[PDB]
Each structure stands twice: as C-alpha cells, then as structure tokens.
Amino acid sequence: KIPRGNGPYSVGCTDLMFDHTNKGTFLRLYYPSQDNDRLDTLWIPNKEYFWGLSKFLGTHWLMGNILRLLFGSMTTPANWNSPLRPGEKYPLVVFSHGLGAFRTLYSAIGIDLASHGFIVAAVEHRDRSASATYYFKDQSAAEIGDKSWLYLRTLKQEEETHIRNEQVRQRAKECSQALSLILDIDHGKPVKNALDLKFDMEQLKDSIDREKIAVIGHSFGGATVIQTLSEDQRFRCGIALDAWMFPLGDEVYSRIPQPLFFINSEYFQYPANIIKMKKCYSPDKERKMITIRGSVHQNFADFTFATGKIIGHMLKLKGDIDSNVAIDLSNKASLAFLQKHLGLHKDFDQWDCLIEGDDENLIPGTNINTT
Ligand SMILES: Cc1ccccc1-c1cc(Nc2nc(CCCO)cs2)ccc1C
Ligand SMILES: [Cl-]
C-alpha cells in the first residue's frame, strides 16, 4: 500500500494531455476532491510502462509481463476523476520524475500534497528519460486512441554530458509549458483533453492561487527543479528530492534567485554531487539542506511501498528507516518550506524544525564530507 495523505482533504486524481503530440503536455493531476467514494487510481495504467520498466532494469521485456501480472492491478489511494473540491484557490506544485520513471510513480508525494490543499501536476517527460511515455502522431490517431510509445534512451559514455544536459533543458521547458497549460485552464481557456476522461477541466477555472507556484522533483527531477527555477521566474521556490546534479550546465549555478530546499537520502549522495549542490549557495540566497537518516534513493518514489520489507531491502527499494517514516519527514519538511516561501496561511509552520534537520531521523545539512 501507497500511504493515504496525512492532510484534511480527500484526494482526487486524473490525467491531462494537451496537445496530443510529443511536444504537448502530459501530466497526472492530484487535487483536493469533493468526494471520497470513487474507485482508487490505477498505479501503472498500461502494459507498455511495464515493458519500459523491464528495459530500464536490464531484463527481458517478458519480465515486463511478470511485473504486469504482479503489479498491473495495483491502485494508489486517490479518487479517480473525482470532482475538485470547490470554493477555494489552491497553490500549485509542478512535479518532475526521475530517470526510468514516469508521471504516476510519485503518488505517495502527490496524494500527500493534495491532502494538505495543493494541486499537483506530475509531468511525464518526453525527453526519453521516462521508462516509457506515449503521445499521438496526429489528430486522427488521438481520436481513435492509437498510441505512439516512446521508450527510454540508453547512452554511450561519450553522449552522457551533452545528452543529459539537452534532456534537463527539455524537462525545464516541459515544466514551464505544464505551468502555462494549468494557468490557462485556471484563466478559463477551452482545452480538449487528448484523453477521453470523465473529468471536466472547466472545474479548474478560478481554482489556482496563481502566484503560489512551486517546482519539486526527484533525482533527474531534482536537477529539473534547478534548471526550471533559473529559466522561469513564475516558480517561486523549489524542492529538490535527492537531486542528481550531473545534467546541469556550469552556467545555471549562479542563476537561481528563488528559495531552494535539498532533501537528501543518506545512502545515495557522494562528494561530486554535494559539491554541485553547494555551488547553488550564495549569501543573498535562501538554501536549506537536510538528510534523512538510514534512507536510500528509492525512499522518495512509490516502489518503496510496493513490496514487503525483505524483498524491498534486497531490491534497494527500502533503507534502514521505515518508508512511511521517511516520506512523512520529506513531505512534512516540504509543506513547512512551501508555507514559508509561498506565504501560505496554513499550519505547516508546525514542521519548521524539520527544515533545520531537528529530528531523531534527520541530519542537518549533509553527512558527506567535501574537501
Ligand atoms: C517494485 C516494482 C513494481 C512494479 C514495477 C517495477 C518494480 C521494481 C522497480 C525497481 N526500481 C525502479 N526504479 C526506477 C526509477 C525510479 C525513480 O528513481 C524505475 S524501476 C526495481 C525492481 C522492481 C521489481
Ligand atoms: Cl541509494
């Protein structure tokens, strides 16, 4: 089980694709919902995601079919296509997934944010960093639902620097484009979803607190946080969850005016990576860093909830820390940081001490020694 959110709001979920092409926006939306009696949301909704995941794990695409047999009916606790909870403007989070991931794999995070009164737009990237993604070749294809699938690209060592950077720059553009789509839907623009889903986008009219915008992301998505902030001042702060800093160009480091929070795992980080995070620091800028004790890179994504403790530890899906314990720390510290830098009038300042790494299961800053 992926945990239910800790906040007071029921959670709805839907998907949005606009336009239908490979240059359009594809996102999974988590939102405060009016109703709580809908079907739960299918976690990995298409066989081709399992094929993609199998390719990313270095197994045969038929191991994909075994993963599909085991996980293909798994849900996540969000009311599928539930009506939006009316009568309130909600702050917006744009969320960026890691390498080998896709839009649906960070629901523990998206559901928790939505339960505290956020709308969350978890983008699916078309940069070939997703395990799989899909789109439609043209209008005819979209209509009949003839999907074109795009699978993860494996790089030669010589391609690494250049292609990771083209990818992080495409990802930032995709974050900005997803922001503009939501803001236009808030500002009442008719949008025909390329997906035929029983969720009317007209509900999102006048629903966004249009200045309370953040960008959050894990791993490759954590670098996407930083690139997005440097290029799009509409994002007011960012939270990088175990950021993988390698994709970033030398230029970006001095170019991030917004508050930025690094939440790291204990076991993923390494000097080269930490050195890059410290390059984002400047005396005029707001920066925070915490490390979750006993945690691994996978503690921020949903696979940490998908198996039991023994298999979980073996597959490096789980750390020494309890997965619910770890995500609560990262989600609660994130809420307090967002309240502070978005100027929210909620009770998220009850977790201010977590921003400073003041908890038995937090390390202030980093455990990693650099020079
Ligand atoms: C547990 C599970 C359920 C359904 C499909 C696959 C798995 C699985 C997943 C991993 N790990 C992965 N990590 C990523 C990147 C995430 C973002 O960093 C993609 S697959 C390892 C082993 C298994 C069986
Ligand atoms: Cl790790």
Curated annotation (Swiss-Prot):
Changing D250A: No change in activity. Its EC number is 3.1.1.47. It is an enzyme of class 3 (hydrolase). Changing M63A: Reduces the association with LDL particles. Plasma. Secreted by macrophages (at protein level). N-glycosylated. Macrophage-derived PLA2G7 carries sialylated complex-type N-glycans that hinder its binding to HDL particles. The keyword NAD does not apply. GO terms for molecular function: 1-alkyl-2-acetylglycerophosphocholine esterase activity; calcium-independent phospholipase A2 activity; hydrolase activity, acting on ester bonds; phospholipid binding. Belongs to the AB hydrolase superfamily. Lipase family. This is Platelet-activating factor acetylhydrolase. It comes from Homo sapiens (Human).
